[model samples]
Target chain A: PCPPTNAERLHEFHRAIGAATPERPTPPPPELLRLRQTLLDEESAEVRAEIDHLLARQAAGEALSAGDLAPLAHELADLLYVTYGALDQLGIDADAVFAEVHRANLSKASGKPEGWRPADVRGVIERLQHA
Target chain B: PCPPTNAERLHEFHRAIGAATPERPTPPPPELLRLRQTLLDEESAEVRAEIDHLLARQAAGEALSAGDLAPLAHELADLLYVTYGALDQLGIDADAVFAEVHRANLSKASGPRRADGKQLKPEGWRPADVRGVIERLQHA
Candidate 1:
């Protein structure tokens, strides 16, 4: 299973921030905004090429190293935030889409358990948590 | 950006098939048997409309043309392999469940970042990568 999409990622971030110290109810921290901005800037060919080069190395049987990708991971996190933020501005409801898809998958499963249900996003989410 | 879906314009065939070299394996290959069988016997309308459309194109995309789907891609990949495979088997992994229940999302700032690691896969493959794969593909 893969990670939640950028939209869900952003929502989760906000939820955690809300939960961390419920008393203080400002918007996300300033750093979050700055990071988001950085992501917007980096979501271009320069960053994509850097990441693709890393993937090509892995595909070519080169051993992956944390050092090579750690910073890229950070930059990606920033991009996810910005991407999710853009979705927010557009008023897209990613969660709702997921939920709809989840339910459809369940129906397709037809109580077989192994049928359509297994492919649903909810099923994948559950598996990820327990793992 | 998801990855390429199963069906392409199919006209990519001659280009793909022609480019395929002697160094390559033969067509209508055998190992592809189990995989194709797996895909065909498992088509499900239960899959989303996009997936459904992909399946339709797979059916009537006007005669596609190579390891046409070297591997399934996009949400369709999951729907095709995992979902349809489920039609034949039954098992659940730890990663999917958590993603469905624990995740949250944000869609504002026109472009901002968030730090919610909770909803991601255990390995931390980002959504951007998922989208990237899709965007890069000629189809799907």
Candidate 2:
């Protein structure tokens, strides 16, 4: 059999650590909700910090180096991990939710075949700059 | 032969839409990076807003019902989608990094399982190091 997916591994790990899992708190107790809430909040903030660091460097006229992305990537990964952790704590099947979202995103096309598409750097900048 | 995974599907979709992919850009141009940074920033805020909505409902003494989680789940899914989109745009393979992080997380166990929900990191717990993966996957 293939190795456990990240979701499965996380479920096992959280179970081992006594964090919430599908086996308990079917609705997720209040305290567990708050615990993950705090964790998600903090992890998101760290992600922001990483983005700010890069922006600061850009603002200072420093060349954006390849190595600069390391910290940002690390924090982003943590943010994802914490997000999955929260889902596991809530007994939510993250993979299922993600799949649902993926399907929806695909439908977001404007039907012009060229009018709407997935996001890219220039496209995002154009929309946000105008907004 | 097999159905595409979400990651593969996204890569294909992005390519069709003229978005960044592994086929282009050595080290994503600065503008692309900024674009993804903005996207990530915006998506994370949306995720937080969902959490806030839930907390507000909880604070109002409303019984947290299964229905309440629908919007939160939707937003979380969007957050994950945006993250993956950004990684794809940056020419990074997100699955590899996720695997790296997952492995390190498994090593965090420090003691026997408990009924209570408290995390304990062992002295030998390893933190995820995805820089190498990032470096390798990035076209640079």
Q: Which of the CAPRI classes, incorrect, acceptable, medium or high, describes model 1? A: incorrect
Residues B5-31 of candidate 2: C-alpha lDDT, one tens digit per residue:
445656866966666377321345557
Kindly list the per-residue Cα lDDT of model 1 for residues A1-131, writing each as its tens digit. Answer: 54454345545555543422121112233233344334344542233454556656666877743234432333333433444443232233334333444455435534344544333443333333242
lDDT for each candidate structure: 0.33, 0.64
Q: Once model 2 is optimally superposed onto the true structure by TM-score, how far is the C-alpha of residue B46 displaced, in angstroms? A: 2.7
Which pairs clash in model 2? Answer: none
lDDT of 2 at A70: 69
DockQ of 1: 0.04
**Local distance difference test, candidate 2:** 0.64
For model 1 the local lDDT of residue A104 reads: 53
Model 2 lDDT at residue B10: 65
